[PDB]
Structures are given as structure tokens and as C-alpha cells.
Amino acid sequence: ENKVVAPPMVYIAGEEMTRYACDLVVKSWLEPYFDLSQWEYFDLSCVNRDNTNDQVLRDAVTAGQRIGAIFKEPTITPSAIQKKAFGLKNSLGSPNGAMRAGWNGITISRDTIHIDGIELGYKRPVFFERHAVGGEYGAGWSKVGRGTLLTTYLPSDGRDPFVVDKRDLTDQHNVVVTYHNPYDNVEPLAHLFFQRCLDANITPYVVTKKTVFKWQEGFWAVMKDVFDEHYKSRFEEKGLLQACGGDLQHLISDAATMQLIRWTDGGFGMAAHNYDGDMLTDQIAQVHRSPGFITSNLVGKAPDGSLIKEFEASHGTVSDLWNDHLAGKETSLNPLGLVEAIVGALQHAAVLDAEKNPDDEHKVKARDQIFNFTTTLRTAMHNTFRYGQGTRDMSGPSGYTTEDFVRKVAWRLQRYLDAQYDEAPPPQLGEPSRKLRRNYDIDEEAINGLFQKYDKNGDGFIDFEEFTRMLVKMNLAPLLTK
Amino acid sequence: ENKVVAPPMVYIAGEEMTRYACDLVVKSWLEPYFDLSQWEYFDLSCVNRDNTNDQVLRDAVTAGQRIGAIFKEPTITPSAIQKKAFGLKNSLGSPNGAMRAGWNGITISRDTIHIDGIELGYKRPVFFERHAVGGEYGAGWSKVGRGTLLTTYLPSDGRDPFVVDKRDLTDQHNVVVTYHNPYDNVEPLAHLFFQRCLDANITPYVVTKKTVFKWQEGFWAVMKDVFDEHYKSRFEEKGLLQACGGDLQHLISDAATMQLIRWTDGGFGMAAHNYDGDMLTDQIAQVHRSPGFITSNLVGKAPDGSLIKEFEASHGTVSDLWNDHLAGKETSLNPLGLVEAIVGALQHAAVLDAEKNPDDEHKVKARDQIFNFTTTLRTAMHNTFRYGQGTRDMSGPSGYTTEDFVRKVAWRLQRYLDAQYDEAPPPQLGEPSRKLRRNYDIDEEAINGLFQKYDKNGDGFIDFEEFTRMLVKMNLAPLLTK
């Protein structure tokens, strides 16, 4: 064994089907080739989080700032039923607040693609930057009765306390809501967003409700300033500002969610506030395929100012497939998002190892080894899917189980690492019918109803005319240029 | 000479094409049969609002409290350019805050229908209660720097000032936002909403994001408590809780916005917060022709306890047709929404007259006179549309001008009031192709792209399969139950 020593990396584990499948993937695709040992595991199981009163969470955050590259598994934010069943003494919420605080912010939700010949919802990649902090999700509130509410601001600027808002609550049933948006890291965000769009040949956009909530116009201002100063020239010089008329376009929240579903050939990126970005990314996810086919990557700033990158899949622990496994029924979990997050974490760990130790040879070379490996591992997994041996949500009921999918990808991976151009090339495909998706069984009787509805002619005479009627009746016909 | 005396009613006038067209409708359809004179006009033109520094709006509010029945025309909330041209020296905003304060609240957005046989988007009436007060639209905010923000609540319950939220703002560019919801009049709202859904055989629903925004859970509670206590029995007696499973259903606002577009059969009602209600009623408007086909009716409480009702169309002053009118080019403005508002205001004025003066004979029958009149007035307007002599956005290019339509409806109204059944009945119609809508021209080659290409299967040859997939790929196929 002369295996490569993987760079230091934080590894946060959860429970259930995703813990089982990540364990399977690391053992089959990584330990064959890597000395881990510099990985720093943390058990964020519900039970382990509760016994340590979340000291394992404070240790994961600490390890993350010091190391700066972290893969995290899906975790259970236990519901009351689940909190009782597990019997956790002192309920603890989502670890997200801890991580996003300890590491600074922004949350990249970009579509996953099988660049070797499986079409998905979007023909070309989509990027999305969901501002990691601020907004309604972090609001403080209280139900209050009669009186007056007073919002003061106390500057460290030495100046006098500021009356932000004062109001006279006449009712005996009120709710009051207060929150903030921190906007410093909007200019880092812009640089991350615009630059990654440059590299990818993506037309970028900014999405807000700034016309209606004027407190949001700061966001768009910084995005605009940074853009005009540093990237507009390079964007036109690549001819990407073309489908948006020469400048960075602002989209109001509610025209954004339409070009999402419309410009279905992809090749666009969007940046937005935390709440809006959550909603819009769920929407992009559904257009592309399912939630597991979207990235969920925190990018933040370490105290020293280096990049902290944390990677996640966009699904939970998948309890029902866990129960199927416990009762000996076969399961078929798509590991795509999980694998993508693991190789992102590993890649950034290698990058940080070289950046933290320049003037070290076998670290700028370890990085290049890592990137070549993750490239041929992607090939092994995409080709497996293309040979019809993907999991059952993509390859249909003849698709492999979780375990034989992992094993078959390891088989191709050991071969691909030694030339091995046997088999033959797998085929180009096309969207596996979305009905293969888990927990998506439609309503064939309803959709009968609606196609016969738009008839009034014969055996569904569409002949475009009905299509046009449909799309206007739908309120989805593209408007004109004007 | 013997015309009926209209009950007292406030009339708020605006500017431009709707002021001219309302003046014409009142002169042609009402003045023939009614002595107005007890109508109390207020000029809320931009110029008169700015010269009086909105004392005209404040007097209108006072008169509306005294009379309680108000028609208001669209008014201009002037844009900077428009404020320049008009030369208004102290900008004054929307009259909405004043009216909703002076009269209490909730904003009714219900679909308008041509009960004599022209189908539109929804087929059966849809009701919507948008909570008139509270929420994000009435927020205080500020740009703040480094420091600490402090939200105090000072009860008149005499107890100690309450720390709603305190937070430690580290950034140098922050925005802070605070707002409230008054929830007393939710139970008035419930009674208003549930009872009218009863009268109309509408299944009611409540829409919130209470699951993600816990402070909204009050809304669902009050609405539910009233329902279960005061209306559930009557709704099941009518078998209206059938498609919603026996009880009052709460919908998260993003499944609401799905059944909106889905249940195109109508026959449902929704109540929501001020902000969500704004967005969802814009969407209901779109499913059903255009925004001008949705009412906008304030309902509030006067000091005496009588209902205060203000009615508006859901469009503006229609500036572009005003430009055309001043240049002597003909215009064709659909007065449907404005008329629906005028006869609603007139009905409520008659109702208030009777309720405020019982032991008065010719007021309880003046009420019935008004209602008979408005019914034959609806028949005349609907029928004119069905004879193809409506305005051109409904009747295509052979439709009449604003002025010819008003004259033709006046002719039919005069004849109908004299038991004159000549002519011959107009036909049943069907949605006038929405391309006839003003300022709505489709990008037919884009929609080519989508039909000619996207659902291939040869030369057109769409039956199901591509329809079903189409609904799947856009994420608009109806799924499974829970």
C-alpha cells in the first residue's frame, strides 16, 4: 500500500440511510486509494448531539475554522414525535446557525450535471447564490398586547441612540417582528458570483424585491457597483451580456421565478437574499429534476480571511429508505449530491493545504492528484448511470440497489485508474422519466381531465393553436420585447 | 319629472381616462333614473391633493366614516417623472394608509363574472380576503452601522417593558426592519369571510406561512376557532367540506399558489395576511383574464358598528388611453371593473340608509329599487358584451369605443326597464382570446420554439405522452395525496 495521504478535512456525520451510504462510498471509492487519518470526524447523531449538549457541534465548528474545508452529512432536526422516540432530554435545533456564524457567509445552490451524456432538466448549468445570513428566518418576535413598540439602535460609532421605529399598538393581540440584513459580505458575494459565472460562460442576474421593500436596495447597489467596476467589461468581451441588453439586469422576485421555468436551456446564474434564495432554489431544483440534483455549499471567510468551504447534499437522511433497509427490503438511494459534496470538500481541502503551505512541492502536486482522481471518479459514476446501472430513480426498475451501484462504480473506478477502455462507451441518454423519482407518483386521472379539457375539437386536436390557448390560459405565454 | 333619490355616498374622483369614463358612466346610466345630490364628491387628483396638502383626503376619510359607503376611482401615486411634469411641491403618497386607518380593515379581491354566458378563467366565483392591516408593507427600517439593536415593547397593561429582540450588529452596513400585525379584527374577518363563502357555496381556506413564520400561527388559530365554533356545522350541512376532508384546511402559501392555477373550476375562497394576500390576488387575477377583472373592496368598522365599504377597480387611470383621448384618437376602455365598484358602493349606500333609519318606509323599498336596477344594469352590460358590441379587449377589433359601448348599454338599459324584449338573445361565448388584452402581445416565435420543437413526437403528433411529460418537466403535474 503506497496510498496518498488526503489533506486535513472536517467530516460531519449524521444518521440513518445517508450515514450508511456515505460510509459505503468512502470505504469503496476512497480508502482503496487514500490514507484518511487527517480527516477529523464528528458525530452529529441526534443522540450524540444530546449527550454532549452540542459540544460535538462546537468541536465541529472549531475544526472547521481551523481546517476550513468541511463535508457535512444530512442531519435530523428532530420533530417532537422523533424527539420523544429518541428520548433526547433537551431539544436542539438545526446546526446551521452555529456553522454559518462560526464561518461567515453565503450559500451556493448550483445544479448537478452528468456531463457525459445524461440530459436533465437544464441543458446548461445554472448557478445560484443564496445570501447566507440575514432575513426573515433569523427574525426575533413576540406576541404582545396593548402598548407601544420601540426599536432603538445603539451605535458603537459613539453617537446618540437612534429611534428606528416607534408605533402605537392599539390591539390586545399583536405580533411584532424584527430582523436585520448584514450587508458587508455582499461585496465578497458579488466577486464569488460574477467570477464563477465568468469562468462558466453564465449570464448572471440579481433578484430582489427592492422596488417594494426599499431596505433591500443596498443589496442591488453593491452587486451593481462591484459588477460595473470589475466584471462588466469582461462579460461583454465574452458576449454574455447579450440576452440581457448590455448591462447586469435586475429581476424582481416574481419575474425571476418565471425565467427560471422558461429559460430551460440553462446557462444562467442568480444571486438573492437568504429567504428569496431559499424559495427560488427549491423552484430551480424542481425544474432540473429533484432536490438531490442541486448543490448546497456554504462559502464563508475564516478569521485569517481564507475561504471556508462546506459542502452538503440537498436532501435529508431519507428515513423511509432506512426503514426499508432495516426490514431487509432493497433500497436505491441516489448518492449524487452526497458524492458531489464529498469531492468538493476533498478538493477544497487539497487547495487549502497547498495555499497554507506554499514552498512545499508535494502539496501543489497532491492537489493535482486529487483533482485528477475526482475527475476519473466522476467518470466512473456517470458511466455507470449511462450503462443502465444507476440507481432506480434514474435507470428504472432494472437499476441497481444502493450497494451494487456503489460496488459497480468501484469496479469501474479501479479499472479506469489503469487505462481500461474495455466495455465500449455507454450511450447518450435523455431525461429518465421523472416518474421514477421517489415520492412522486403524480395523479394520472387528473391529467387525463386537463388534456381532454383543452379539447373541444376531437381526439385532442392541439395543432399548436390549442397549445397557444393553453399557455395564455396558463398565464405562462412569453411576453414581447418592447 | 320623478327620479329616485340616491342614498348618501362618498365619491372620490381621480384623473385622466378613468375620471372621464366614470363621469360618463354616471351621466349615462345613473342620472337618467337617480337624483344624486346626496353624493359627496372629493377630488383626489394629484394637483388637488398637493394644493390642499391632503386635507381633501382627510375630509374624504371623515365623510366616509359618517356615511360608510364609498366609491373611489383609481388615483395616481405619482412617479418622480410624473411628479416633475405635474409640479407637485410636497410629494404625498398613496391614500391607502389614511383610508384603511380611518375606516379599519380588510381588502376583498373577488373575481368578476359575466353571469350571462361569457366564460373567463375561473368559471365559478373565487373569493379572497386580504387582511387590510399589518405586515411587511407597514415596516419601519433604517440603515445602521456597528452597534447593537434593541427592540422594546412598552405595555399599557402597566407591567415592565419587554425585550422583544436584542442583537449585536457587527457589520458596518446593516439594514434593520421591524413591523407588527394587529390581530383583533381577524375574528371580524373570519365572520365576514366564512359567512359570505356560505352564502355563495364556496369552500373556504386559510393561507399562511405559519409553519416557517411561527408568529403567523395566530392568524390560523383565530380563523380556525371561529370556524369550528360558528360555521363548521353549516358548511357540512351544505356538503362543502368534501374536497377538503371534513374540516377547515390550512394551506402553506406555496401550495395555495398551486391550487390557484390548478382548480380552474373556481368555487373556493382564501384568506391571508396583507403581503401574501397582495401576491396571491395578483396571481388569481392572472388566472382569470387580467387585473381589471378582480374587485378591490375595503370593508371596515365604523364607530357605530356599521360596516364601512369602499369599492375600487383593480386598475389605474390608464394613462396611455388618456394620451390617445386628448389627441382625439378613439379609445376602448373596459368599464367593467369600475362599474362593479360603482354599483357595489351604491348598493351599500342603500343598505346603510335602511339600517341607519328603520321605522322609515321608503328606504327599505328604495333598497330593493336599487338592487333591481343594478341587476338589470348588469344584464344590459353583460348582454352588450355578448352581442359583440363590448369594448375591443373582449370583442376584438369590431368592438365599440368607450363612448359607443356606454351609449349602447344605456340604450339596452332603458329598454330593459320597460319590459322590452325585442332584439333576440345574445349567444353563449367563451374566453375572448387573451391576446386582445391591452399591452399584452405574445412573442409568437418563442412559443413556436416551445411547440414546434419541445413536444416533438413527429409532426405535432401530441397526444398525452408529450402533454403528460410537458406537465412533468415544467413541474406542473398534479401529484399524490398525503
Residue numbers in the entry:
A (entry chain D), B (entry chain C): 5 to 486
The authors write:
Isocitrate dehydrogenase (IDH) plays a critical role in the tricarboxylic acid (TCA) cycle and catalyzes the oxidative decarboxylation of isocitrate to generate CO2 and α-ketoglutarate (α-KG) with divalent metal ions (Mg2+ or Mn2+) while reducing NAD(P)+ to NAD(P)H. In accordance with the preference of coenzyme, IDHs are divided into two forms: NAD+-dependent IDH (EC 1.1.1.41, NAD-IDH) and NADP+-dependent IDH (EC 1.1.1.42, NADP-IDH). In the present study, we investigated the overexpression, purification, and detailed biochemical characteristics of a type II homodimeric NAD-IDH from P. tricornutum (PtIDH1). To our knowledge, PtIDH1 is the first eukaryotic homodimeric NAD-IDH structure proposed in the type II subfamily, and it exhibits a unique EF-hand domain at the C-terminal. Enzymatic characterization has revealed that recombinant PtIDH1 is a completely NAD+-dependent IDH and exhibits allosteric regulation by isocitrate, similar to eukaryotic mitochondrial NAD-IDHs from O. tauri, S. cerevisiae, Pisum sativum, and Solanum tuberosum.
The apo form crystal structure of PtIDH1 was determined at 2.8 Å resolution in space group P212121, and the asymmetric unit contained two monomers that form a dimer. Each subunit of PtIDH1 in the final refined structure missed several amino acid residues, including Met1-Val4 and Lys487-Val495 (15 residues). The monomer of PtIDH1 mainly consists of three distinct domains: a large domain, a small domain, and a clasp domain. In addition, a unique EF-hand domain is observed at the C-terminal domain of Gln424-Lys486, which is composed of a helix‒loop‒helix conformation. As with all structured homodimeric IDHs, there are two clefts on each side of the structure, which are formed by the large and small domains of one subunit and the small domain of the adjacent domain. The putative active sites are located in these two cleft regions. Additionally, PtIDH1 contained two insertions (Ala84-Gly91 and Ser323-Ala331) in the large domain, specifically forming two α-helices (α4 and α11) at the active site. Moreover, the dimeric interface area of PtIDH1 (4082 Å2) was larger than that of HcIDH (3638 Å2), and at least a 1700 Å2 interface area was provided by the EF-hand domain of PtIDH1 at the C-terminal. Therefore, the dimerization was formed through the unique C-terminal EF-hand domain in PtIDH1. The structure reveals that PtIDH1 EF-hand loop contains several residues (Asp459, Asn461, Asp463, Phe465, Asp467, and Glu470) that are aligned well with Ca2+-coordinating residues conserved in other EF-hand loops, indicating that PtIDH1 EF-hand loop binds to Ca2+ by canonical coordinating mechanism.
